Amino acid sequence: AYVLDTNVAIHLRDGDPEVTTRVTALNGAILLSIISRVELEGGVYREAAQAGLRRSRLDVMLKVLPVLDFDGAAADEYRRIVESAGYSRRKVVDRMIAAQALAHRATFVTFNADDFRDIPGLSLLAW
């Protein structure tokens, strides 16, 4: 299984053809973090002129893709991450989503792999 980083999911929502083709090549379950959902939901309403298409396209994504809630098991992984790597205010969201991937033994797919190099045990694919 794969957890898509938020940026990847944004490119899917907004119609980036390079990402839409990459996603069909993944050989496994494709999972979305609820934290990414929060970010995606907010983005719908950032620009009124794009909100109609962002809403409809996000709605189709959220219908199909299974969503990972952020629960105690993920917060336990987050604790282990900061125990090892130290605290980074800038990377909290990053580490929350990575924590969910760790808890669910899933590979994390991201455009920003360098910000995840300090997370022990994480399987990462850089796009």
Partner: protein, 80 residues
């Protein structure tokens, strides 16, 4: 649906089965997708395939541009 358990495979009919505790169980009419990669099994409600999702998105118009994310969302709280 935010719970953890430990269990053991058993036999049911001519097939292996795995018990799902109440806190982890899906509805009895929910079609599920089951996918194994290595020794990890991932189970979720069947709601369409990825190829179908991508085809549906490609039949739809897209926004004029791709949003520039803001990842740096957590505020600096006094005192932890």
């Amino acid at each position: 649906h935010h719970a953890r358990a430990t269990g053991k495979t058993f036999r049911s009919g001519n097939s292996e089965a795995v018990r799902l505790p109440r806190d982890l169980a899906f509805g009895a009419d929910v079609e599920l997708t089951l996918i194994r990669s290595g020794d990890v099994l991932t189970i979720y409600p069947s709601k369409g395939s990825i190829a179908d999702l991508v085809a549906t998105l490609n039949q739809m118009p897209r926004p004029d541009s791709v949003e520039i994310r803001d990842e740096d969302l957590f505020p600096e709280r006094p005192g932890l």
